[PDB]
Design a protein around this ligand. Sequence first.
Ligand code: HEM
Ligand code: HEM
Ligand SMILES: O=C(CCCCCn1ccnc1)N[C@@H](Cc1ccccc1)C(=O)O
Ligand SMILES: O=C(CCCCCn1ccnc1)N[C@@H](Cc1ccccc1)C(=O)O
Ligand SMILES: C=Cc1ccccc1
Ligand SMILES: C=Cc1ccccc1
Ligand SMILES: C=Cc1ccccc1
Lengths: 436, 444
Amino acid sequence: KEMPQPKTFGELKNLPLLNTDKPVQALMKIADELGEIFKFEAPGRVTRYLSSQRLIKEACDESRFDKNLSQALKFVRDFAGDGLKTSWTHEKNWKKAHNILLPSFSQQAMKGYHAMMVDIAVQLVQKWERLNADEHIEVPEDMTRLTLDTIGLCGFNYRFNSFYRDQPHPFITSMVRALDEAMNKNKRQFQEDIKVMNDLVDKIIADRKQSDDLLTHMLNGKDPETGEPLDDENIRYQIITFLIAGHETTSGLLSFALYFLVKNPHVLQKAAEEAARVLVDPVPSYKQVKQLKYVGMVLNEALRLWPTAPAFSLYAKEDTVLGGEYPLEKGDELMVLIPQLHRDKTIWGDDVEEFRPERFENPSAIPQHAFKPFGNGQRACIGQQFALHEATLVLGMMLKHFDFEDHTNYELDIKETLTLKPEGFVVKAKSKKIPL
Amino acid sequence: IKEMPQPKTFGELKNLPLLNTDKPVQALMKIADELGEIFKFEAPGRVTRYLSSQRLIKEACDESRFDKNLSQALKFVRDFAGDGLKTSWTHEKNWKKAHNILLPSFSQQAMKGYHAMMVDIAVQLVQKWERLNADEHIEVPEDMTRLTLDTIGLCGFNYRFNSFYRDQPHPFITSMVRALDEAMNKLQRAYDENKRQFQEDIKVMNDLVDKIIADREQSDDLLTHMLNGKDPETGEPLDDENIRYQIITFLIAGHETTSGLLSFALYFLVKNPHVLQKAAEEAARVLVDPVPSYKQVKQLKYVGMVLNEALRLWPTAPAFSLYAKEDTVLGGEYPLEKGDELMVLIPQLHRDKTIWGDDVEEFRPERFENPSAIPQHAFKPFGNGQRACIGQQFALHEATLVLGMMLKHFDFEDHTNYELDIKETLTLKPEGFVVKAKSKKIPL
Ligand code: HEM
Ligand code: HEM
Ligand SMILES: O=C(CCCCCn1ccnc1)N[C@@H](Cc1ccccc1)C(=O)O
Ligand SMILES: O=C(CCCCCn1ccnc1)N[C@@H](Cc1ccccc1)C(=O)O
Ligand SMILES: C=Cc1ccccc1
Ligand SMILES: C=Cc1ccccc1
Ligand SMILES: C=Cc1ccccc1
């Protein structure tokens, strides 16, 4: 009945616990000590961190809880506006934009994105096959090049041309600094950086003046409910939203996937063997990517251990009781600590920290709400299928074309922004000399 | 593009008289030894291809290219199992409903509710064995069938077959075990007495199920999920006709293949004393209470490996059938047209030396220490894909609980030096397998 709570810092309460460069991993350690639920207090704020499937499946009851904007999302809202990810469910523009943009993430839409995904994936393979002997790969940096370019091309027919650069694009230079101010919360840079983004979004809009992409549905798509299309201001927020949401969590997944592969050679061989027998053409087709089952299992197990969007927030729609012993009042917050939920020994067994993609051969074997890397309910990730198709294509192409070596025997160091990434992860790729 | 081998033919009967034998799975295994990874098998009105290598079977398990086919054996079982889960086609509406309605009752979480009743039946087995007089022996497959039938009856439907109080098995299964016999005999096959008996058999099995369905305060069991469960997709519950078919289906599928596994597991243990001692040592240090708990059974890792290795050599459901959803090519050299059949010869697949090495015939549970070490689709005792065994974990929990309790409570002796004689129905079992058990005098 009484909720545990970590150590306090006087009038600052629990807030200095987050004054660290790895806040998610610190919260995981607290969850290891205090268990499935603990209170977290800050000046002006109270929330509860859930970490067990037993409590989180109740929090995922959409009749009792709705998506809440965490403090991290409130700061992203200062430039993402009422885009899909930083709007409340009751805001008119959420459901409107939701109804207009859901078709562009359908299976018929994924078939149309596929050619442009392969375009960027080929650029990645050719960069690696053009390396000299004893040169290494900076994995998360190259994966960020790929995912940013994919969403730019597939979504808006804009070429960031990240593989022609050392220093990333001027647009995201503002982003990582603007997102830095958001996570760290200099105010001059934030305002000057926010303008830089709107200036790109203008170039992307003016240039569209054909195509079958996200940007088309935003200018021409009409919400069946209200009959209205999106107004100019909201489209600009969606572009910013999709540029951000569309790349960084996907590049973390690919980076973590390759990390776990080179640390588990038995899993690597099974995935490489599948890639070899399935990807028989010089360019993978859409149907061939759907056939990479074990590769998809690899990606899901990487998302289990290190889900790159590591939390989401909920609030109680009415007075209710959680787990039969924790009464909540209307408006109270919850935080779903996804990495801890995915380490629930009562769901996954004792080998939670081991990388075994074989857990995911049967999706029906996994209990309800035990696996939530993409959020929950109507506010779940709209880009899930985009993300998994791109990552499966790219990982399959990587496994087909190269043998990989953990030549520094890398020690996992997870850098935390609002997402997770293995920092300093480097490998060597020995080409298999299979032409494209 | 290669031409497919084929065994000897019998004129207009083609290959069919090859199955006119009392050990057809072992006969098909011998043909696979002669002809290799694939061979065509023809019968009047029927053609299928038997796969035996991981190389081809890993392709056949691609669900975008192949779907479950009802073999001639499953078609005959359908005459009384109806559109139950095991004898329905994937596109039949009642498959996906019953599948969506019944998966929760087979979840790893769900076993915790079955566990007490599994222990109920397992204690009766231990107490029967410690109550034997000196120099009395155990009839292993007979007692394992007593246990598994009672477990599925109790855990699934709160019905007590009370097999450990009987010499002659239950009247229901006498019809059931005879119905599977007549169905099996029809493949190899004036027969009016066979058809009169068959319908009378369906009547005994049905009327018993309608006793419970008509008879049945709620419960944890399967039957509760069937009467109250609603398909999340269509919102509909099962109709009464399908429910009875599921009961018949689960009564059959729930016990017969599981008792063969336990029988084969105990056979291999007493033929490999070093493995038995290693398994017995784990049982002792883990089963520290008079009654095993759910957690402790989960901790019997080596026992689970023992059961997996028994399933490798003699998978008690020895085959399953597939059909090509579209024109495709198997292995780059065998073209298949839409609708063509395959048969997966599971015991032969599990003897692929390119997967397991040259010691394929040796009982070594350590092969299953790492699941990530096993190549894809090399181990298929429970079928494939969405049409895989729904009761897989029920079976493995029951067998692990029962086998661990046996190894904790008795030392076993192969006092006749039993020669393995595998009886074939639609499943496999070691016939005539008998042992002596010296109680260790550990109370319950
Ligand atoms: C690759 C791995 C990805 C992960 C782990 C991930 C994670 C998540 C999570 C957890 C949420 C729910 C956040 C919340 O409930 O507060 C979410 C929402 C969202 N994601 Fe992703 N995402 C991924 C890929 C993508 C991609 C590729 C796109 C764009 C194409 C995208 C666009 C969005 C959008 C628009 C939302 C908001 C949906 C809504 O509010 O209705 N995501 N994502
Ligand atoms: C060691 C024990 C067992 C083995 C080796 C085994 C084997 C198999 C195999 C190979 C299949 C696929 C058949 C096919 O594809 O045609 C299957 C399906 C099935 N099994 Fe089992 N089984 C076992 C135990 C059980 C138990 C205990 C139950 C019931 C609780 C059960 C119920 C079923 C059902 C209902 C199906 C059909 C599932 C569907 O098609 O959706 N089995 N089993
Ligand atoms: O735990 C987290 C991390 C959640 C960020 C996920 C962002 N993302 C990115 C893509 N899709 C979602 N954030 C808390 C920290 C906090 C708690 C209490 C008081 C102050 C701060 C919060 O911001 O509320
Ligand atoms: O022998 C078998 C073995 C099938 C038994 C599997 C039944 N089971 C029981 C529980 N789980 C599965 N299958 C073929 C034989 C045949 C080949 C060619 C022509 C006619 C018959 C078939 O029945 O089609
Ligand atoms: C709170 C920030 C905001 C952003 C866009 C529209 C309305 C409000
Ligand atoms: C979840 C929907 C909602 C709608 C209006 C107010 C609060 C919540
Ligand atoms: C990280 C810098 C860089 C520079 C050139 C090619 C690839 C990477």
